[PDB]
Design a binder for this molecule. Structure first.
Ligand SMILES: Nc1ncnc2c1ncn2[C@@H]1O[C@H](COP(=O)(O)O)[C@@H](O)[C@H]1O
Ligand SMILES: [Cl-]
Ligand SMILES: [Cl-]
Ligand SMILES: [Mg+2]
Ligand SMILES: [Mg+2]
Lengths: 315, 176, 175, 320
């Protein structure tokens, strides 16, 4: 019951086992700042250089990183006609440009990948995952990422900032608890997929709708109850950057709409099989959390919460 | 060749004495099921669930519970969702399932929430004095009423077990 | 808001379970098995006689906890599988007519089995008490693992006599 | 159980309560025969007369009548071009021709009905129910029968229908007709008890004829009835029934009707064309209850329980 595990138990567990420690997050941010400072310095000496900006872009920049972070997400804005429009070529272009701006590193440290270029340092901290963004001068650092997908890292970061401002600490913490749970489900369940961004937008919609995030068991239950009862068939649109009129008609089963790009459906790829998996998992987790609320002993309460958070949870 | 029985070594202890701790273990799982019903159908309330749990503990401890149903009822007939718990002896390995698996998204517009209890033979055979001592702590008292019917079928989907005893759960299911 | 079963509606004060009551329950199980035979080919009339005999012995002695009869595909019960669970008679007492075996279900690769779980009274009885109670058994069962269920369980009938009940659950295909 | 009620019990209940006693059946045949002989004599004197023949056509003619038989079925073959097209005029025309041929009858005793004409006998007699058949001289008295269900014209042959039944009775003397009668008795009880329940007697006969052709054993009545109920329940009346007595199954054209039990005389005439899903559901639920009861009675431990189960099938007239 709550005597055995309550909101403060979950909050302690999140710090001990879920959240990225501040010390480590500082280290990663300084790593990215180092590259960014080098790029700014090189850009200053060579205004015609293609790489115009490097922006931390992922969970670390949004304050939603988990202890299991394995690289630092950054976006690099690329301008000019020389840059290719094919991902293999563009990543090659990005790599060569990164090599030019970083003369202290050897060429082999900068290695391209399928969707990004990775900057790795041997034996000294995490790698830097760089995603190219084609830039043509649109406002708010809008750019395109096999067609071109428009995006703005600053606006994406702004969107999350507003929700964190609405519920300081609690929003980012619940997002991390839900992501931590989703990661456990993927290793335990085969067809299970749940994009981190969808989790973030679903929870942002709940926060906008007035759900209270200051009690983590109940906030998670609102999240799980939403998934089960809407069955991911309720369209999620935010009016931060455009009115809901802009979306138009969609044929997609799940509709969770990019708050920066009204034409991008984040859940576009998700099938009915993916949905049934999320729903089943959410029902099980909701069943476990309510079981823990009434469980007569600490041992049963912990065992129920371990259905949600895994063996690392000990109450 | 094709006639089998449960393995002898797989049987659990058959000489268990049912205590209040076993009662609380079963009643906590019912409370959970009731809270799951509330999340998807709005009833019963947290305070009612707490009183149902107290009631269940008292009757289970005394051995006076035969069967109890909670859920939505139209006319005199249960509809989905309705959870029914029948007390019985623990069999075999003694299945002790986790609570949960309430079906969401069912239409309950016309019905109101109710609960209905049937007492056991031990209760009916008990003296008045035995009843008074065993049931002092009841959170409320029940009044007789006509036994309700079922609009749908019953699915036997969970068993809760403790102290040599089991609670068998059937869930009412709509015809589809 | 909170109701219970009417006192008058409850059963007769004194009921001692006898072999008469056992035969009343077992005849209804036998009927169910013959309904299965007519729509699924098994079990045979001669087998049904033995199953009824066995049920009467175990029922009379109070040794039956639960028994299942039906088809298995892979290593799980499929529809049709009939399961009878011994319990105490409750309330007014429901003593249903036997039957209501659905036809038309797929039993293509399947074989017929029966599986019994004994009661806690069987387990607490001495070997001397067991042997006198199970003297008239028509056949003997061998230990086996409890098989799974492919589908869900529908609680669809209750047979009652002499202060005791048999609750029937039927395996159903997932739909 | 079988010690309390077995085949011999059912056979005896059939004689006591179900079957039409022979003395009554002989009286009814003589009633029909008297009209037939009077028509034959009239037609002999008046060869141009429209009414060409009267054939006993129903359960009495087939040996499948119940004690509850309420009138005597005969078909009257009407040729010529004087008969109007519409149902009301035809039945009025038939009434008129009947009075011409039986001038001794009080004219009021000849009464048009919905799809037939009634001839009433004043003293100690059932009515004769005359179904018109439009006839143009074809072999085997082939003509267009007027359906007693909806008045549609059904091209068929009543003599060949009587032949069809007689061949099944030859294949199981006494037992086939007895099981038909037990099943009709059941169906009659169901129609009183159940709201949407219909089950045309000719359909019951065709279903049982198919079971017999398939090798079902009719010599034990509990089991023969179980085969009938089991067939209804497991096919749900969705198995097409076709006989090859008079044509090969290749002559059957595709049909969309829900229940298809094809006239053994005419490959395009579906005897069950009017049966709806609700009708079928009523039949199936009833057949399932009947089968459950009969097998319950097979093992029931007491005579009282056994009789109660059989009364679910045959009603309070059944006492064991
Ligand atoms: N649908 C039908 N098609 C052709 N003949 C029919 C039909 N229904 C009834 N009959 C005839 O009417 C006779 C008696 O029917 P019943 O009154 O059902 O015994 C049958 O033997 C057939 O000759
Ligand atoms: Cl990141
Ligand atoms: Cl007739
Ligand atoms: Mg990354
Ligand atoms: Mg008639």
């Amino acid at each position: 019951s709550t005597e055995h595990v309550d909101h403060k138990t979950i909050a302690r567990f999140a710090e001990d086992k879920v959240n990225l420690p501040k010390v480590k997050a500082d280290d990663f941010r300084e790593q990215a700042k180092r590259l960014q400072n080098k790029l700014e310095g090189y850009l200053s000496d060579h205004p015609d250089f293609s790489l115009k900006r490097m922006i931390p872009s992922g969970s670390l920049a949004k304050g939603t990183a988990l202890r299991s972070l394995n690289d630092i997400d950054v976006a690099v804005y690329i301008s000019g006609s020389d840059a290719p429009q094919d991902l293999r070529g563009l990543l090659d272009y990005l790599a060569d440009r990164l090599r030019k701006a970083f003369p202290n590193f050897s060429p082999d440290q900068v290695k391209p990948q399928t969707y990004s270029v990775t900057v790795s340092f041997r034996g000294s901290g995490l790698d830097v995952d760089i995603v190219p963004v084609l830039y043509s001068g649109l406002p708010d650092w809008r750019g395109h990422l096999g067609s071109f997908l428009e995006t703005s890292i600053p606006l994406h970061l702004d969107f999350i900032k507003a929700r964190k401002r609405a519920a300081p600490k609690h929003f980012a913490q619940v997002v991390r608890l839900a992501k931590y749970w989703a990661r456990l489900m993927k290793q335990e369940r085969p067809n299970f997929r749940f994009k981190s961004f969808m989790i973030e937008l679903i929870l942002a919609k709940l926060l906008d709708n007035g759900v209270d995030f200051s009690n983590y068991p109940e906030a998670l239950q609102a999240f799980f109850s939403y998934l089960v009862s809407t069955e991911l068939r309720e369209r999620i649109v935010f009016e931060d950057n455009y009115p809901a009129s802009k979306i138009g008609t969609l044929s997609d089963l799940v509709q969770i709409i990019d708050p920066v790009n009204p034409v991008n459906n984040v859940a576009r790829l998700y099938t009915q099989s993916n949905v049934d998996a999320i729903i089943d998992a959410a029902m099980d987790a909701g069943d476990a959390i309510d079981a823990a609320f009434y469980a007569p002993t600490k041992q049963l309460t912990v065992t129920y919460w371990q259905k949600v958070f895994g063996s690392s949870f000990q109450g | 060749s094709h006639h089998h029985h449960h393995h002898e070594n797989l049987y659990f202890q058959s000489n268990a004495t049912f205590s209040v701790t076993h009662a609380r273990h079963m009643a906590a799982k019912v409370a959970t099921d009731l809270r799951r019903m509330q999340r998807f159908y709005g009833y019963p309330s947290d305070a009612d669930i707490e009183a149902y749990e107290e009631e269940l503990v008292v009757f289970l401890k005394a051995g006076y519970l035969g069967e109890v149903s909670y859920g939505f009822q139209k006319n005199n007939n249960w509809i989905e969702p309705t959870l029914r718990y029948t007390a019985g002896d623990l069999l075999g390995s003694g299945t002790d399932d986790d609570p949960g698996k309430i079906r969401p998204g069912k239409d309950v517009s016309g019905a109101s929430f109710y609960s209905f209890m049937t007492y056991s033979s031990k209760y009916l055979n008990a003296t008045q004095s035995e009843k008074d001592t065993a049931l002092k702590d009841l959170p409320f008292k029940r009044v007789g009423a006509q036994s309700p019917g079922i609009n749908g079928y019953l699915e036997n989907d969970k068993t809760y077990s403790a102290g040599g005893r089991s609670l068998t759960r059937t869930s009412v299911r709509n015809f589809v």
